[PDB]
Design a protein around this ligand. Structure first.
Ligand code: CD4
Ligand code: BCL
Ligand code: BPH
Ligand code: BPH
Ligand SMILES: *[C@H]1O[C@H](CO)[C@@H](O[C@@H]2O[C@@H](C)[C@H](O)[C@@H](O)[C@H]2O)[C@H](O)[C@@H]1O[C@H]1O[C@H](C(=O)O)[C@@H](O[C@H]2O[C@H](CO)[C@@H](O)[C@H](O)[C@H]2NC(C)=O)[C@H](OC(C)=O)[C@H]1OC(C)=O
Ligand SMILES: *[C@H]1O[C@H](CO)[C@@H](O[C@@H]2O[C@@H](C)[C@H](O)[C@@H](O)[C@H]2O)[C@H](O)[C@@H]1O[C@H]1O[C@H](C(=O)O)[C@@H](O[C@H]2O[C@H](CO)[C@@H](O)[C@H](O)[C@H]2NC(C)=O)[C@H](OC(C)=O)[C@H]1OC(C)=O
Ligand code: 0V9
Ligand code: V7N
Ligand code: V7N
Ligand code: V7N
Ligand code: CRT
Ligand code: FE
Lengths: 299, 273, 39, 315, 62, 71, 103, 60, 39, 55, 39
């Protein structure tokens, strides 16, 4: 019933984050206790035996096996190789019936997506990085899935739209900015969603005396902006084109593929998994030559 | 100097503490023991404000900003340049405001008046004490108080509001605003009625209680009466400050989510869940 | 104000209504327990 | 208390007189021709708003009550400017706004005529005219910026959404000096009515609430009221002139408010930057610092149109 | 053109001149009772000098 | 000790007493209902060995924190 | 240049070539705050001005089943994030509507 | 014990009694209706073994 | 006012009613402790 | 003691009882909010299992 | 109002009640101590 407070700005500005202490302990325990333990590494020699491996070309055979154990733990349950594979023939991309193993097709794309996130969007995920667990939480469906609805849905800021600014960078009115008050309402709706997705308030990213200011805002605002650019890449190039792959039970009413948003990783916390650092333990997923100076164990 | 009828009223008595020792006037002002303590706290607090301005970046009146300490200091007295000066000024303010209310009680007692004015002013002191004492104490740091600066405290109000994403949805804030707006309407209405009977159009007799009663009944559909409108004005003005004190003390100590999602209880009433 | 004669007659009904209410509530609880016990 | 009198024949020479004070009829609550028309026009405005709100939950009467404070009759889309919009996209809004505005003006006339009939000064209709002035700036400022989309939606929480977004769009309304003045008079109105209400109740034992008698024939209740404030704060009003202080503080609330709205988006588009220009903004240490590459990277776009298609990404 | 001058600043100083004019008016009205002041050094008016005492006529019933 | 009723009006004491006992009973029931261990409507059928118990301590990974970094 | 020269023999700070008795510090106002010079300086520290909006050439109506009944702009955050009653959720969009001859 | 109805007026008490019982009964029904275990309008036809139960201690 | 004649009889009812209530509550705690002890 | 001649016992009794009730509730809620003495959830733990603050 | 004889007899039961309360509190503390010591 006590309130925890974190100061995030200068004295007396009231740039502060408030947390109900009992609720936060509960949410935190419900992450730590289910947090999956990682198997330890190895370093064997030799050339690769694989028949139909297309992304994980660059890691040892032991690292590959350890990765597959992690993926099943993170998406399907600790032993559930049958979720993706014809267990009689791991190289298959089809069932014995000939029908495609769509989960394996998706998982191959999810590997490329995760390497793209960790490699190209280090300005967002830094050295925490993401793994399959960050979205999936041990389950096939992440949180925060969204589909086409109406034209003015603000979640399309994370897909095809660009531009949320409404404030004028000058004293006098000009033709440079003709933003409506309705557009300020739309940005305000978008920004409530981001605040809720992280379990923070507006002062985490702004000094609300001037929402346009970057100098007065905490550095987290710059990280947040890279999160928008990352989601546009993730949605447009990886999640949305999987439309022909899924069964129709996964698709929206418009027949579109499920798309991600801030809450999909963050799940209401200021960092995903309260900043648990798992990606450093799984070189298969880095998309980098080194993780925090630790070099990639190539082949 | 004295009003042409005043001298008759300047008797001893009605003091609370000092007896006859401070029971005197200085120009128009009554002194008394709480006059002495008032001027002490006013002078100390003002000079420490001027010192806070002097060690700050500018003398521009609008930009002066004596800020509270960082939250890390908790309920301790911080270093003076780090916000301990704000804490001393806050004690001086409480001393001044309390002394002012008690001095008003001595003046009312000396004139044979009821204590309505001291108690009405207590509604403002309650709201101030909630902002700088009670809510910071419940949050566990004096650093939650508002800064002393003509515009820098508006930056604080802005950022506190957005700590709850959409502060307009605070239900006690909606009531407090309604009291403030209704008070201002009621003040315009009462002020206009008294003036318009006492200042009728040129060449017209001075109006009567009956005329303002007739007109007021046409405005609201009931007659409030002469004492009733003053009870109403006091109720609205003081109720506004009391609901203001409630609306800020529930924000943080008791509610910590966005204010819009507080309304989830209304959407889930079982008649329509 | 009331007489003791009326208070006697009132209390008889009052206690009897209390008993009837307690009886019905006891059947209601045993039905509920039989359907879905809470311990 | 609890010794009420009750008067069977008519007081004014419980019950009420049927009669005349010259031109003024007494008895019924006065409407006249302007009052009747005001209620007709205003009723149609209320009906249009409510029927649009109820239609927006698909006529569901349970959702109409459950969702009521979120329901809106919403102004036209921005790209229409001042042109007539489609009926479902703000045409009903402008129609309700028109009838409401006529109804308000007819109510002002009704009040103005009644004051003159009762042979009273004109103070109340000019006080009401200050409130109507602020109201009308929610028409004139959208007109001056050139789009009915900028008008206030009819709805409990929706008009508060607009109030926040207006301050956001124009770069923090706290730095609008006429907003700041309007708040000073709003608070001052609460200060004055607290002080005055408490003062008159404090002398009510001495007949102080009979203010018109105390104005025309100063009693000891007036003298004690003046001396309390003179002894407290060094200056005083009179039993009459305290009502002038009251009148002006209420009136200046909405008058200075209306000027602040009319200036916004027409003369100043960012009030915080106007505050910086004119020296209102207190300095704080920088919370972040951008590199020159970030100054280009972190500029966004101004918000545009919503996507009118559902792209496939067939790849 | 004028950079520092702008219409919001012009409007605000117009309000200040009006407002101080209004405070002077109200303080004149505040002095229709109880003035001039008594003092040991003789009568005193303060500032602004008060408006005169005001006589009220009542509706004739004769 | 009966002289206590010469001091305090018996008719009024009963109303005060029942009011206190009613408030206290409701306060204790709602405190218990809000707890994990005694949320008896949902979990009353659990055996005493299966009912929740508070932790001997909470735990964390060294890089995790429940609160964001501040100052 | 952020500190004055130090005499290496005594360790004293030298200000304008002459020693100071004491440990010298550079004076600053509260927390190093500095008055903002003008709007141009404030804007020089910000990002560049936003790019012009992307506006569509022409408007294509969505299917009627994708058109919101509620035109309030913030409704998706202020109500629909928390409200998930089935009947109310159905009322959010217009129902299907077809010319009778196409049935 | 009927002498208690010389102290307290039956008119006052029987109104207060009916009021208290009605409020208490209604509070309990809505508390149960809001629970998972006893949301009987949706789930009343489930057998006792099928009805929800709150989470046990893991103890591990 | 209250008499000694009223007071001594009233004290009998209060004490007996109090002790009766405390006894019923004691059994309720016996039952609760048997179902789910708190120490 | 003659102290009951100074202060009305009929007042002191009520003031004392009210003071004790406030103090008793404060101490229970302080303890209930602690880690070590949150007895409703953790009362069945043994003294060597119960929480202790950092050394 | 009060008398010295009323003060005497009131003081008697007041001291008795205080001792009784302090006895019960002392047992409650020693039960609590035995369950979970605070030093
Ligand atoms: C003037 C020409 C230009 C004009 C254009 C610009 C200004 C326009 C306003 C002009 C107003 C009149 C000024 C004046 O000279 O007044 C003399 C009179 C004193 O009473 P009197 O009846 O007239 O005279 C009797 C006296 O002469 C003889 O009796 P005695 O010998 O016993 O009196 C001792 C004297 C000594 O005289 C003085 O000390 C004069 C002090 C004037 C102080 C003004 C400060 C203003 C700046 C403050 C900056 C801040 C400093 C911290 O009288 C006294 O003891 C003084 C009694 C009055 C105490 C006033 C206390 C403060 C009032 C509020 C201050 C403003 C708060 C925002 O004092 C007063 O009446 C002052 C209070 C009246 C105005 C209150 C207005 C409040 C508006 C609040 C809303 C603001 C919204 C934004
Ligand atoms: C995030 C939100 C923004 C903000 C945005 C705005 C906006 C936008 C406006 C205000 C305005 C006002 N604000 Mg601001 N405001 C904020 C913070 C504050 C704070 C604070 C402690 O933080 C306070 C005290 C205030 C106070 C005030 C008032 C001084 C002022 C309104 C005066 C008035 O009487 O209006 C109430 C009176 C009226 C609206 C007049 C109504 C009269 C008509 C005639 C009534 C008709 C009734 C009709 C017939 C009834 C039937 C209707 C049908 C049901 C539809 N604001 C922040 C910075 N504020 C207004 C102003 O003047 O700005 C300069 C304004 O427009
Ligand atoms: C409760 C209902 C409303 C109310 C009523 C009210 N106010 C009252 C009264 C009443 C009934 C009085 O009798 C009393 C009075 O005497 O009025 C003339 C008063 C009063 N209301 C005042 C102001 C005031 N009231 C406000 C509000 C309200 N007053 C409520 C809305 C506000 C707001 C909202 O901002 C203000 C500014 C004073 C004019 C006066 C009390 C005078 C007093 O206490 O004097 C002694 C103290 C000083 C002269 C100065 C003290 C200086 C300090 C030691 C240092 C500064 C510290 C301060 C915290 C700095 C703040 C800086 C700001 C930029 C943030
Ligand atoms: C000085 C500034 C303050 C101010 C002042 C003020 N307002 C005023 C006045 C004054 C001095 C008035 O004299 C005037 C008034 O009448 O007061 C009672 C008014 C008024 N201020 C109002 C509201 C108001 N004032 C506000 C604010 C303010 N008012 C400021 C704070 C606010 C806010 C804060 O938002 C509101 C909402 C109104 C109560 C009133 C003006 C009433 C009016 O114009 O009504 C027009 C008519 C209608 C709305 C239609 C009603 C329709 C019926 C409900 C239908 C019933 C059926 C009908 C019978 C059918 C027709 C059949 C026919 C045959 C009859
Ligand atoms: C699913 O189908 C794919 C091919 O579509 C099989 O993949 C094999 O291994 C790949 C490395 C290789 O690239 C690919 O060419 C293929 O050799 C995968 O093993 C699964 O196979 C089963 O389904 C096959 C299918 O395509 O439907 C089926 O193939 C046979 O039957 C289809 C008609 O139903 C006919 O078009 C094929 O020509 C025919 N091919 C063969 C080699 O028989 C497989 O049947 C057999 C015996 O292989 C299925 O395999 C099993 C064990 O059931
Ligand atoms: C569906 O179409 C609309 C309308 O163009 C697109 O909305 C545009 O982009 C939004 C982000 C923005 O908010 C909105 O103002 C509007 O500018 C919407 O995103 C969908 O886009 C896809 O379809 C576009 C289309 O108009 O058909 C298509 O646009 C390209 O092709 C059309 C001709 O079919 C031509 O008129 C356009 O100029 C052309 N634009 C570009 C930038 O090439 C999009 O194609 C591309 C590459 O953008 C479609 O996008 C995708 C990923 O399928
Ligand atoms: C009850 C009585 C209250 C009286 C006080 C009223 C207070 C304030 C309101 C006064 C009007 C304000 C007008 C503001 C608009 C304004 O300033 O716009 C100017 C043009 O100049 C102008 O309009 C100059 C305006 C001069 C105003 C003179 C005084 C006001 C007379 C009101 C009479 C009312 C009688 C009833 C444009 O500004 P900019 O920034 O684009 O210019 C630079 C571009 N690069
Ligand atoms: C979610 O879990 C939570 C809920 C939180 C857990 C907590 C639970 C708690 C704290 C529960 C508390 C329960 C309680 C406490 O008091 C319960 C007490 C209940 C009681 C007292 C019930 C009494 C009922 C009595 C009735 C119905 C009487 C009927 C009388 C009738 C029919 C007679 C009619 C005829 C008359 C009168 C004629 C008179 C003759 C006349 C006039 C003549 O003859 O003249
Ligand atoms: C952060 O703070 C943290 C650390 C959390 C906390 C801090 C805690 C602190 C500092 C606590 C301090 C506690 C304290 C200090 O002294 C506490 C002092 C306690 C005391 C004194 C208790 C006294 C109790 C006395 C009782 C119960 C008396 C009962 C009397 C009875 C029953 C008699 C009734 C009436 C009679 C017989 C009259 C009828 C006869 C009549 C009329 C006749 O005969 O006529
Ligand atoms: C969340 O956990 C937290 C809260 C934190 C934990 C802490 C909790 C704390 C601190 C609890 C403290 C509890 C407490 C402390 O003392 C509790 C004290 C309780 C007490 C005293 C109960 C007393 C009950 C007495 C009763 C029921 C009497 C009934 C009398 C009857 C029936 C007689 C009626 C007869 C009549 C009327 C006829 C009269 C004669 C007539 C008419 C004639 O003669 O004519
Ligand atoms: C069957 O009857 C039912 C049940 C439907 C009746 C019930 C109705 C209900 C429940 C109604 C509820 C109404 C509510 C809750 C209303 C809330 C309103 C609020 C809070 C409004 C707040 C602000 C609104 C403002 C400021 C609006 C201002 C609009 C203006 C100034 C518009 C002016 C338009 C003009 C002057 C002219 C337009 C026409 C032109 C000249 C442009 O020509 C096209
Ligand atoms: Fe008055």
């Amino acid at each position: 019933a006590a309130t925890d407070t974190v100061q995030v700005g200068y004295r007396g500005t009231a740039m502060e984050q408030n947390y109900d202490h009992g609720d936060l302990k509960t949410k935190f325990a419900q992450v730590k206790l289910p947090q999956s333990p990682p198997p330890a590494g190895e370093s064997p020699p030799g050339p690769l035996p694989w028949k139909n491996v297309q992304v994980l070309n660059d890691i040892s055979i032991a690292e590959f096996n350890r990765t597959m154990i992690a993926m099943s733990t993170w998406v399907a349950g600790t032993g559930n190789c049958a979720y993706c594979h014809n267990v009689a023939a791991f190289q298959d991309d089809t069932l014995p019936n000939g029908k495609p193993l769509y989960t394996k097709i998706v998982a191959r794309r999810m590997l490329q997506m995760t390497r793209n996130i960790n490699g190209n969007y280090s300005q967002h995920v830094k050295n925490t990085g993401v793994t399959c667990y960050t979205c999936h939480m041990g389950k096939p469906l992440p949180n925060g899935l969204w589909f086409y609805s109406s034209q003015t849905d603000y979640l399309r800021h994370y897909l095809d739209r660009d531009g949320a600014r409404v404030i004028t960078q000058g004293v006098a009115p000009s033709n440079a900015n003709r933003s409506s008050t309705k557009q300020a309402e739309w940005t305000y709706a978008l920004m409530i969603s981001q605040s809720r997705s992280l379990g923070v308030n507006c002062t985490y990213c702004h000094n609300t005396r001037q929402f346009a200011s970057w100098r007065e805002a905490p550095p987290a605002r710059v990280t947040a902006y890279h999160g928008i650019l990352m989601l546009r890449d993730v949605n447009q190039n990886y999640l949305a084109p999987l439309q022909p792959v899924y069964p129709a039970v996964r698709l929206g009413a418009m027949g579109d593929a499920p798309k991600a948003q801030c809450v999909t990783c963050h799940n209401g916390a200021y960092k995903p998994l309260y900043g648990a650092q798992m990606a450093k333990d799984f070189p298969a997923m880095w998309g980098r030559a080194d993780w925090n100076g630790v070099p990639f164990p190539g082949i | 100097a004295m009003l042409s009828f005043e001298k008759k009223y300047r008797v001893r008595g009605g003091t609370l503490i000092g007896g006859d020792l401070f029971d005197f006037w200085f120009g128009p002002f009554y002194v008394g023991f709480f006059g002495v303590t008032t001027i002490f706290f006013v002078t100390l607090g003002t000079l420490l404000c001027v010192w806070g301005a002097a060690m700050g970046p500018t003398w521009n009146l609008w930009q002066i900003n004596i800020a509270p300490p960082d939250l890390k200091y908790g309920l301790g007295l911080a270093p003076l340049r780090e916000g301990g000066l704000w804490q001393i000024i806050t004690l001086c303010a409480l001393g001044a405001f309390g002394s002012w209310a008690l001095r008003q009680a001595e003046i009312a007692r000396k004139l044979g008046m009821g204590m309505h004015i001291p108690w009405a002013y207590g509604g403002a002191i309650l709201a101030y004490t909630t902002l700088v004492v009670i809510r910071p104490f419940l949050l566990g740091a004096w650093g939650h108080g508002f800064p002393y600066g003509i515009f820098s405290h508006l930056d604080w109000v802005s950022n506190v509001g957005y700590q709850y994403l959409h502060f307009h949805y605070n239900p006690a804030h909606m009531i407090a605003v309604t009291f403030f707006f209704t008070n201002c309407l009621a003040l315009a209405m009462h002020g206009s009625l008294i003036l318009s009977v006492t200042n009728p159009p040129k060449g017209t007799p001075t109006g009567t209680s009956e005329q303002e009663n007739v007109f007021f009944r046409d405005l609201l559909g009931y007659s409030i009466g002469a004492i009733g409108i003053h009870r109403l004005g006091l109720f609205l003005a003081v109720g506004a400050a009391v609901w203001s004190a409630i609306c800020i003390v529930i924000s943080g100590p008791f509610w910590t989510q966005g204010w819009p999602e507080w309304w989830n209880w209304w959407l889930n009433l079982p008649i329509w869940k | 104000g009331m007489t003791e004669e009326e208070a006697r007659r009132f209390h008889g009904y009052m206690v009897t209504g209390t008993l009837g209410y307690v009886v019905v509530a006891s059947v209601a609880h045993f039905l509920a327990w039989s359907w879905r016990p809470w311990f | 208390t609890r010794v009420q009198v009750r008067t069977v024949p008519e007081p004014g020479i419980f019950s009420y007189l049927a009669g005349k004070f010259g031109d003024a009829q007494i008895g019924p609550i006065y409407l006249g021709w302007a009052g009747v028309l005001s209620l007709i026009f205003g009723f149609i405005a209320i009906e249009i708003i409510g029927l649009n709100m109820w239609a927006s939950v698909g006529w569901d009467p349970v959702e109409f009550i459950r969702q009521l404070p979120w329901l809106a009759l919403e102004p036209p889309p921005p790209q229409y400017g001042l042109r007539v919009p489609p009926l479902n996209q703000g045409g009903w809004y402008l129609m309700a706004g028109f009838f409401l505005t006529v109804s308000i003006i007819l109510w002002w006339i009704r009040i103005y005529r009644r004051a003159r009939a009762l042979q009273m000064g004109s103070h109340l209709p000019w006080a009401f005219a200050s409130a109507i002035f602020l109201y009308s700036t929610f028409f004139f400022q959208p007109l001056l910026v050139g789009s009915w989309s900028e008008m206030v939606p009819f709805g409990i929480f929706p008009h508060l959404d607009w109030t926040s977004a207006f301050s956001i769009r124009y770069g923090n309304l706290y730095y609008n000096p006429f907003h700041a003045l309007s708040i000073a008079f709003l608070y001052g109105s609460a200060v004055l009515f607290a002080m005055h209400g408490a003062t008159i109740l404090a002398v009510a034992r001495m007949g102080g609430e009979r203010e018109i008698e105390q104005i025309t024939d100063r009693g000891t209740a007036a003298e004690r009221s003046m001396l309390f404030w003179r002894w407290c704060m060094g200056f005083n009003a009179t039993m009459e002139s305290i009502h002038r202080w009251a009148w002006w503080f209420a009136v200046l609330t909405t008058f200075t408010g209306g000027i602040g709205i009319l200036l916004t988006g027409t003369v100043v588009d960012n009030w915080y930057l106007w505050g910086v220009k004119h020296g209102l903004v207190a300095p704080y240490p920088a919370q972040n610092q951008l590199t020159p590459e970030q100054q280009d990277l972190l500029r966004g776009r101004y918000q545009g149109t919503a996507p009118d298609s559902f792209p496939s990404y067939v790849v | 053109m004028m950079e520092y001058i702008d219409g919001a600043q012009i409007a605000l100083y117009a309000f200040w001149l009006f407002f101080f004019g209004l405070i002077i008016y109200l303080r004149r009205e505040d002095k229709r009772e109880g003035y001039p002041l008594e003092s040991p050094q003789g009568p005193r008016d303060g500032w602004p000098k008060g408006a005169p005492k005001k006589t009220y006529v009542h509706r004739d019933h004769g | 000790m009966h002289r206590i009723w010469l001091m305090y009006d018996p008719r009024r004491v009963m109303v005060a007493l029942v009011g206190f006992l009613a408030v206290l009973a409701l306060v204790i029931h709602f405190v218990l209902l809000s707890s994990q261990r005694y949320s008896w409507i949902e979990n009353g059928t659990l055996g005493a060995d299966q009912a929740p118990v508070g932790a001997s301590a909470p735990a964390a990974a060294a890089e995790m924190s429940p609160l964001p970094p501040g100052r | 240049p952020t500190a004055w020269p130090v005499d290496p023999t005594t360790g004293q700070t030298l200000i304008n070539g002459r020693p100071v008795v004491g440990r010298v510090f550079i004076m600053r106002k509260t927390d190093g705050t500095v008055k903002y010079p003008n709007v141009a300086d404030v804007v020089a520290h910000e990002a560049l001005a936003p790019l012009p909006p992307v506006v569509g050439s022409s408007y294509q109506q969505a299917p009627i089943t994708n058109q919101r009944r509620m035109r309030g702009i913030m409704i998706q955050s202020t109500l629909w994030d928390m409200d998930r009653k089935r009947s109310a959720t159905r009322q959010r969009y217009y129902p299907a509507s077809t010319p009778a001859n196409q049935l």
